[PDB]
Amino acid sequence: PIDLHDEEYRDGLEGTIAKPPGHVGWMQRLLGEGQVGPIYVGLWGVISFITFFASAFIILVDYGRQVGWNPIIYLREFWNLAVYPPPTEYGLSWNVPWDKGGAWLAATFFLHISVLTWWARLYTRAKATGVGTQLAWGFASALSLYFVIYLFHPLALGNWSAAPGHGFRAILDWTNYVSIHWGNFYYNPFHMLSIFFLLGSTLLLAMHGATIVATSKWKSEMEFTEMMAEGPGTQRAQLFWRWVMGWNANSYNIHIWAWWFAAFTAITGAIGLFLSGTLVPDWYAWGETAKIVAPWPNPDWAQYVF
Amino acid sequence: MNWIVATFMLMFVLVAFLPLVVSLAYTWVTNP
Amino acid sequence: NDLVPDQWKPLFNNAQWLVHDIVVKTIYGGLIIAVIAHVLCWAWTPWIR
Amino acid sequence: NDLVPDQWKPLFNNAQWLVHDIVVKTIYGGLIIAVIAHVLCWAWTPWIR
Amino acid sequence: NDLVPDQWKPLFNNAQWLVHDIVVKTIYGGLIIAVIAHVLCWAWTPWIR
Amino acid sequence: NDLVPDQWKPLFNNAQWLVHDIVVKTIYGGLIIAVIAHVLCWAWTPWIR
Amino acid sequence: NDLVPDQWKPLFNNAQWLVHDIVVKTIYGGLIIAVIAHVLCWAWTPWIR
Amino acid sequence: NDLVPDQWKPLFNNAQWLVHDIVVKTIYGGLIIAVIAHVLCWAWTPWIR
Amino acid sequence: RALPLPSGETLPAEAASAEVIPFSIIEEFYKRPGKTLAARFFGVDPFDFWIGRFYVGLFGAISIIGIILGVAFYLYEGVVNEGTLNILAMRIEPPPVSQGLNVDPAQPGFFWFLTMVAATIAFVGWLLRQIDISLKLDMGMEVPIAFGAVVSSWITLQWLRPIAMGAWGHGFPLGITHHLDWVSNIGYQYYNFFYNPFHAIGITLLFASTLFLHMHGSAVLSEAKRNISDQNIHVFWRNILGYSIGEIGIHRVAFWTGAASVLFSNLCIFLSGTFVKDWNAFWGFWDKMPIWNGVGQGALVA
Amino acid sequence: RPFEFRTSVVVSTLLGLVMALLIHFVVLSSGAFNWLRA
Amino acid sequence: RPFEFRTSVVVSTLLGLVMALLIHFVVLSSGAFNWLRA
Amino acid sequence: RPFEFRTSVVVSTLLGLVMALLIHFVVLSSGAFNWLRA
Amino acid sequence: RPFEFRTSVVVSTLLGLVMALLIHFVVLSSGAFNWLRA
Amino acid sequence: RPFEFRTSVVVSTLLGLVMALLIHFVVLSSGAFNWLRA
Amino acid sequence: RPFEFRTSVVVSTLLGLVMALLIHFVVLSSGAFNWLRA
Amino acid sequence: RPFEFRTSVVVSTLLGLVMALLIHFVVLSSGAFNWLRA
Amino acid sequence: RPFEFRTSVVVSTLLGLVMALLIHFVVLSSGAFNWLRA
Amino acid sequence: RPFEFRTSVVVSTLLGLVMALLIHFVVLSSGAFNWLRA
Amino acid sequence: RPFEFRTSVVVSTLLGLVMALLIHFVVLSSGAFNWLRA
Amino acid sequence: RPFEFRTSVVVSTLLGLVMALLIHFVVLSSGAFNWLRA
Amino acid sequence: SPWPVWSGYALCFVPLAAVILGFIIAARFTDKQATSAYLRLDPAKAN
Ligand code: BCL
């Protein structure tokens, strides 16, 4: 009931564009597939694209306004240019001047619409091509963290200034400022959980990719086939991990592990960030009452001084 | 000692890079 | 499509017409309630000033 | 395509013509409302000054 | 592509010619409106000074 | 490609030649306008000084 | 590749030779303009001093 | 690879030999220009002192 | 017959060469003794047996010495010597920077040095044992390459950087919740480690690693127990994003991004110690690159 | 047909909504009107 | 079916909900109406 | 034909909209006109 | 044919638009002209 | 054939444009010539 | 047979060794005995 | 046979060596003996 | 052959361009010449 | 063979070398002897 | 049957050991008893 | 059979154990009772 | 006074307990599935 050629080569809305697929060539040699292929434009991709374009255009022309409309100062400061949210005074209000957070509110609203309609695109194309919707729900977990960062944590704190400032350097600055404002995010326990899951995400990704590339000669990478009957490459992979660490997964379990480790990264991160402002104003002070802070009576500070 | 030893350890960090680079070049050479 | 007027038969299924009727009546009720709410909020605090 | 004028038959389906008529009338109503809103906002506070 | 003139038959479909005519007339109307807007904004506040 | 001169037949299609003619005439008109604009801006405020 | 001299036949297609001729003449014109611009900028303000 | 001398036939294609000749002559011209530029910059301001 | 599948689905056998084979059969078919690194070098692997499911090689025995001694030294320094009794409050500290590179059994920080040496022996033995087991199974050397990336991240932090700095007190303390104090104090000493470019690359690759992991788990789980032509996931990945990397491509990118993250990361902390003291001062050259020096006024000049 | 009516409808409606939001946002932030206590 | 009725319903309902939330948010944050102790 | 008419229409319309927005924003931010409270 | 005509058209048009925008912005930011209150 | 003519054209044209932009920038930022109020 | 005897032996022996080490470490760190210079 | 003799030998010998090293290091670091300048 | 001629050409040309840029920038920044107002 | 003579030789020789290195390093780091300037 | 006897044995034994350790640790850290130096 | 009985048993037993531990720890940390040294 | 706060406990320790316990159980079931008998290609033949 699903035409794979029709889903790739229909025309117009609820069809694809760039339909004569190009070949990158080096992508085929290094990654095994070089076809750029047609890309779908399905009334959710359109909303996503134009709302992201509105967001990015607002941000870029406010970058231009900030450099006095100088396109060299633009290129020089592009990475430290940012459109900051409204300041703490008049914090949740949208009646903020355009230069003092007025541009940030509009751009962030259009970005919200863009990410939501991109989620809808993921969902609808998963249903349209016959696969499960696991990617849409993984994106929903990522979006839980995202909407805590930009919508739900600024609210419940009372100010838009709690949100990042739409810039290459502003997100780093935002992370620094939020960990500094709420004590020390190292003692945020859900931050520790989310780091557990992020470093376990990278560890499982590296292990999985390495195992499948090592057993690649026996076509272990064809997971769809291996989930029907496990070939010799998957057998060698299972035996490798059984002999290394005493237990193993099959062709199917390992991807459950992958999905859930990444989803837990996003979810525990959202929870910890939302807790830092609203319930626990200070994480190090909380860590002392939680007895998770090591006593440091006489530190050797010669290490930390030049 | 500061700069000689420091640069030797720097070169060990880049040596650590090396195996991954060999993997990428392996993929390229063996996919002709 | 026996229930749909011929004019809208190319567009509306038989079941889609009833759900559309519900949506239209809901939108109309919500519009009346929204007009009442706006008149009340204006009598309370005019936002145009 | 019967309901479509021959001039626009290469472009408009039978169902697309009715939806286009709705869109055109909605755009016209919105334009009238927008003109009224602009005249009212000008009588209230001229933005050109 | 009969409605297209012979010079532009290699380029324009029958339906693309009508949409091109609409686009051309819209661009011309927008140009007239833009010229009027520029003359008005100049009479109001000259930007070149 | 009957409309293309035989010198440029290896390069230009029949339709590409007409679009190229439009592009060339547009570039020439834009060049004349750009020269006029530069002469006017120089008579107004010389940038080389 | 008939239009190409036999010296450059291993390198240049028939169409690539005409585009190469255009590129060469454009580079030469740009070089003359660049020399004129450099002489003018030197007569105006010598950068070597 | 006929145009190539038999000494360099194991290394140079027929087309690669012409491009190599262009590269060699370009390098030689650039070297002459670089020597002239260095002599001029030395006569202007000696950098070794 | 029910015909159980690897996913867990039982499919009723008509609605391939596959047969329902026990794992014990798979495991005993692939034993193949004597292909390990130690068996090439010495002519025999001293430990060529399996203890339970685990393969015990020469490097597995070295690794288990390292593991046991590291755990016991860790717990000596922190139960004793510190008295804490709770592992979240203990503080396994290197010798003070005053001591320099030399180690003294009488001076404090000696059990950190032993825990670090035994942990290095354990990690390098784990890596060499992964090489052993990949050699036994005729696999590629990719899992050892990725684990070697992370082991070199450990070597950089505890061996290369403390040696280059020259004090051996620049290794991070081995305390739960307290190595975080070192990470925070090192991150703020060379202020704005965010502006460290190899650190930004490392964070980019960590976030991209988690994103690729989620996307790959999603893709394989989405096609898992369905009637699919194996090209449905490719069509999905071309409808979304207009590119499908393929089955072998996603695992290659997984491995590469995973390893490269920590490789650029250890380049960051090593440079942070030795060559760059301030990561904001590092970026002072940018506004002075001569192509945009001149154009600015007010606060818009630099 | 070269142009689908559904595509033009989607594009025009989305452009109009985005422009209405943008213009409302710009006018409200300008503080030029005294609307919502400006 | 050039336009599915379900699609128009989803889009209109989501747009209305998003706009109601946005307008409520903007009006509340404006402080122009003394709601819940301003 | 070298250029689909739909492609030229999309590109020209998007370029015109982007340029109108850019010019409006440059002119409004310049404060040179006394429009929207200068 | 070394170069599709559509490719050259796209590249030239985009280069011209980018250069016009860049030169306009450089000239306007220079404050050398007294245009738009400069 | 060592080099497609299209490749050499793309590379040379892009190099020339990048170099023209770079040299213009460097000369304008040097303030060594009174170009654009310098 | 619910439990292999080898499994119970491994588990019991490892538990006993871990507990002996833990109790020795706790008693030595307590400083309650004056053993090994208190 | 519940336990290969080679396995028990390996485990016992490794445990004894690890314990001898651990006890030597604990006793030497304690400074309780005056051995190797303690 | 050990080296494709195209590879050697690309490498040599890129090395020469990078070195010319580097040497120009080093000489300009040195302020040793009085070029571009130095 | 569970107990190959080659296996015992490898294990004993490696254990002896590792122990000699470990004891030398412990004794040299102890500073208890005045060997190599201590 | 709902539960393998081996599973219940493992779970109960591990729960009992964990709880004994936890309760011992809590009671010893409370300092409420004067056991192992007050 | 909506739920396996073993599943409900596992879930209920684990929930009860977790809740007993949580409530004990909350009550002991509250210091409201004078249990284990106030 | 020796006792961390209720908050501390809930947050750190029952998520710590959950992660450890849940990881161990997920590994148990991961390997029950992976070592169960299902359709594999016989190694003697395919290899
Ligand atoms: C207060 C005066 C402010 C100003 C504030 C605004 C605001 C605020 C807006 C505009 C908008 C517009 N202004 Mg203005 N505008 C000003 C100055 C100007 C000037 C001028 C040079 O001075 C000009 C030329 C314009 C030009 C315009 C047009 C771009 C547009 C109105 C017509 C249009 O195309 O959309 C016509 C609109 C329609 C055809 C949409 C019809 C939609 C239908 C009616 C549904 C409406 C939503 C409805 C509630 C949903 C109900 C659904 C339920 C299910 C039933 N403005 C001054 C500065 N301007 C309006 C716009 O839409 O921007 C695109 C708008 O939002």
Ligand code: BCL
């Ligand atoms: C207090 C006065 C504030 C203000 C605050 C608000 C608030 C607050 C809101 C609006 C909303 C709207 N305002 Mg306003 N508004 C103001 C000034 C204006 C001005 C003007 C120029 O002055 C205009 C033109 C508007 C225009 C509008 C429309 C966009 C909209 C109302 C009609 C509509 O389309 O949705 C009509 C709505 C419906 C058709 C939805 C019907 C939904 C049904 C009834 C269900 C309701 C939810 C129900 C509780 C769920 C029950 C389910 C259970 C299972 C049974 N406002 C001033 C500044 N405005 C309303 C809106 O919806 O935004 C989209 C709204 O939320």
Ligand code: BCL
């Ligand atoms: C106030 C004077 C300001 C200034 C402010 C603006 C503003 C503001 C704008 C321009 C725009 C333009 N200006 Mg200017 N401009 C100034 C100085 C100059 C100078 C000069 C050297 O002095 C020049 C040459 C220009 C040149 C131009 C052109 C680039 C363009 C107008 C014609 C055009 O191509 O688009 C012609 C436009 C059309 C063909 C579009 C037609 C669109 C149709 C009419 C729909 C309009 C939208 C409609 C409301 C939607 C309704 C849909 C409903 C469903 C029915 N400006 C001074 C500094 N300039 C306009 C532009 O569009 O930029 C691209 C514009 O936005």
Ligand code: BCL
């Ligand atoms: C003012 C004097 C400044 C200076 C400022 C500049 C500037 C400014 C530029 C150069 C550029 C160059 N300078 Mg200088 N230059 C100076 C000192 C020097 C010195 C010397 C030691 O003193 C030297 C050797 C050079 C050397 C050079 C060459 C690298 C180059 C000019 C020839 C070239 O190859 O490109 C020749 C250029 C062409 C062949 C391009 C032809 C392009 C055609 C004509 C199209 C032009 C664009 C056109 C408008 C597009 C229209 C398209 C429409 C669709 C129709 N300069 C002093 C310091 N120099 C020029 C350059 O291009 O850099 C690459 C340039 O941009």
Ligand code: BCL
């Ligand atoms: C200076 C005194 C230091 C000290 C420093 C050292 C040093 C230093 C070493 C030992 C080593 C040992 N010490 Mg001690 N030792 C001290 C205090 C003690 C005390 C005690 C309680 O006081 C005891 C019981 C020991 C016990 C021991 C044994 C573990 C061992 C010596 C016999 C052995 O088994 O290896 C006997 C060794 C052999 C059988 C190896 C034979 C190898 C052959 C001869 C080859 C030698 C290498 C040769 C150069 C290679 C040539 C090859 C060419 C191709 C021809 N030491 C004091 C603190 N101790 C030695 C050891 O080997 O550790 C394992 C050693 O390295």
Ligand code: BCL
């Ligand atoms: C924690 C859950 C335990 C469990 C614990 C119990 C307990 C305990 C009992 C049963 C009993 C029953 N369970 Mg059982 N049961 C479990 C799993 C199952 C499963 C399963 C899916 O496999 C099933 C199908 C059943 C089915 C049943 C029936 C065999 C039987 C009758 C229930 C009834 O009629 O309720 C109808 C009755 C009610 C729903 C009353 C509701 C009570 C509410 C909460 C009011 C309580 C008032 C309270 C006592 C007063 C509080 C005052 C304070 C002292 C201050 N149980 C799980 C493992 N089950 C009952 C039994 O067998 O009788 C001998 C019973 O005593």
Ligand code: BCL
């Ligand atoms: C000191 C008074 C404190 C307080 C401290 C505690 C503590 C401490 C606990 C509770 C627990 C509970 N309290 Mg309280 N509680 C208080 C105030 C209240 C109030 C009230 C509004 O005031 C209420 C309604 C409750 C309600 C409750 C129930 C949730 C629960 C007891 C019945 C239950 O379901 O589990 C009934 C329990 C069982 C059915 C488990 C039976 C287990 C069997 C007996 C095994 C026990 C373990 C055994 C030692 C293992 C031996 C195995 C060997 C192998 C043989 N508490 C005050 C503040 N509360 C208890 C609980 O269990 O939480 C779930 C508990 O841990």
Ligand SMILES: CC(C)=CCC/C(C)=C/C=C/C(C)=C/C=C/C(C)=C/C=C/C=C(C)/C=C/C=C(C)/C=C/C1=C(C)C(=O)CCC1(C)C
């Ligand atoms: C600090 C300081 C000051 C440092 C500076 C010191 C240094 C290192 C300076 C460096 C100088 C260098 C390296 C200059 C390089 C200049 C070049 C490469 C110019 C390229 C010209 C390429 C040109 C003109 C290409 C033209 C392309 C054309 C005409 C295209 C034509 C066309 C193509 C190809 C088609 O499809 C069809 C036909 C058509 C005509 C449309």
Ligand SMILES: CC(C)=CCC/C(C)=C/C=C/C(C)=C/C=C/C(C)=C/C=C/C=C(C)/C=C/C=C(C)/C=C/C1=C(C)C(=O)CCC1(C)C
């Ligand atoms: C302050 C605080 C916190 C205090 C905490 C308080 C608590 C909670 C204490 C808890 C204590 C517990 C639970 C202690 C556990 C003691 C055990 C299990 C000892 C096991 C002994 C195992 C023994 C002797 C095993 C012997 C094994 C042997 C002899 C091996 C035999 C053999 C086997 C099997 C072979 O093939 C051949 C070799 C050989 C014949 C030797």
Ligand SMILES: CC(C)=CCC/C(C)=C/C=C/C(C)=C/C=C/C(C)=C/C=C/C=C(C)/C=C/C=C(C)/C=C/C1=C(C)C(=O)CCC1(C)C
């Ligand atoms: C303060 C601190 C840290 C104190 C620490 C306290 C502790 C725990 C001490 C621990 C001591 C221990 C356990 C020492 C271990 C000593 C051993 C095992 C020595 C091995 C000797 C093995 C030897 C010499 C092996 C010799 C092998 C030889 C000669 C091999 C010869 C050869 C063999 C057989 C061949 O192929 C053919 C011929 C050839 C010569 C090449």
Ligand SMILES: [Fe+3]
């Ligand atoms: Fe996979």
